[PDB]
């Protein structure tokens, strides 16, 4: 009757409840429906290959003992402090490195109970998950950040996780990312971990991150392209005006190698090649070849001036074309993929 004596007669020391077991012990397993509501998304760093999320995880399941008939209401809200007295399905994120609750004014939880025993347990969690990142095409990549859910002390014979049919994973309106573009194509699946101890159940959700290339454009690509298009002017200049061409070539090479060193050391340490590295190397090599071309002209022109001018015009009319064709192949092979 009274809420105090009620919650005592129910899942309390006066009741026959035993929170150290699952429903219908020695029987069929549980069908747990999970669903997460995201609030924030960030800390995506290729250095540690991680990403941070604060989520309002939710698990609905069945517990026949909690079914009651004192109140006419069908759904009831309780106090998180009672949560520690009912059963709870063990659950962890197999792809986590650091994870924590949040304790501010309380232990942030939610515990709804329907007249049919259908329990709903929601918990807020901050998670620094891990994502193996393939950087074959770094500045324009389509990553596959994952999130796994799975039990650790209850096997498939006793516990079975399952997604929710409709709206299993949401995202808070107005959510934006610094240089990534979260996609609404969040593909679900089962990982069904198989260990040397049992057949653990599992669930997984895969987000699709479409990186933004505005930063890399306005910081690396455009400066490199402008430096090369500057260096090209050295070809139009007569072989007599040495200081002009040598200054252009030398400053271009210096700034290009600075950009290369910076944008190469500011990245993680990976063996495989990267598109940005290809581009930096190719621009460095274009300006390097401009310099070596001025050197070859100086050598030829110890008539010889005719060959020097011929090579000068050939370079002036080709190197822009070489960069054009290379840029065409580059963009049309690293963009068509996504």
């Amino acid at each position: 009757l009274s809420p105090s004596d009620f919650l005592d007669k129910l899942m309390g020391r006066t009741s026959g409840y035993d929170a150290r077991i699952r429903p219908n012990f020695k029987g069929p397993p549980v069908n747990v429906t999970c669903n997460i509501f995201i609030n924030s998304f960030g800390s995506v760093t290729e250095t540690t290959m991680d990403y941070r999320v604060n989520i309002f995880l939710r698990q609905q399941w069945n517990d026949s003992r909690l079914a009651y008939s004192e109140y006419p209401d069908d759904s009831l809200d309780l106090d998180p402090s009672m949560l520690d007295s009912i059963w709870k399905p063990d659950l962890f994120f197999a792809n986590e490195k650091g994870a924590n609750f949040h304790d501010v004014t309380t232990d942030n939880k939610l515990l709804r109970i329907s007249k049919n025993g259908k329990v709903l347990y929601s918990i807020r969690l901050t998670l620094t998950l891990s994502c193996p990142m393939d950087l074959k095409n770094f500045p324009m990549d389509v990553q596959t950040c994952t999130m796994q859910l799975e039990s650790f002390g209850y096997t498939m014979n006793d516990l079975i996780f399952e997604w929710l049919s409709d709206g299993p994973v949401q995202v808070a309106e107005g959510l934006t990312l610094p240089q990534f573009i979260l996609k609404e194509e969040k593909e679900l699946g089962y990982c069904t971990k198989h260990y040397n101890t049992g057949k653990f159940t599992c669930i997984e959700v895969k987000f699709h991150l479409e990186r933004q290339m505005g930063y890399y454009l306005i910081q690396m690509y455009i400066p490199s392209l402008l430096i090369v298009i500057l260096s090209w002017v050295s070809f139009w200049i007569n072989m007599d005006a040495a200081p002009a061409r040598v200054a252009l070539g030398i400053t271009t090479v210096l700034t290009m190698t600075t950009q290369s060193s910076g944008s190469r050391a500011s990245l993680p340490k990976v063996s495989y090649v990267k598109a940005i590295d290809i581009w930096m190397a190719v621009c460095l090599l274009f300006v390097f070849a401009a310099l070596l071309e001025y050197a070859a002209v100086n050598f030829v022109s110890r008539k010889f001036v005719d060959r020097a001018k011929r090579i000068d015009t050939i370079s002036r009319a080709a190197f822009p074309l070489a960069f054009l064709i290379f840029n065409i192949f580059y963009w049309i092979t690293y963009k068509i993929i996504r």
Binding site: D90, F93, E96, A99, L125, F152, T197
Partner: peptide, 21 residues
């Protein structure tokens, strides 16, 4: 790693063989 529970696993057999992870 304690998230939604203490991530601990326990098995007991008939011969007394206990297992903990």
């Amino acid at each position: 790693h304690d998230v939604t529970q203490e991530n601990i696993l326990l098995f007991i057999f008939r011969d007394g063989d206990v297992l903990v992870s």
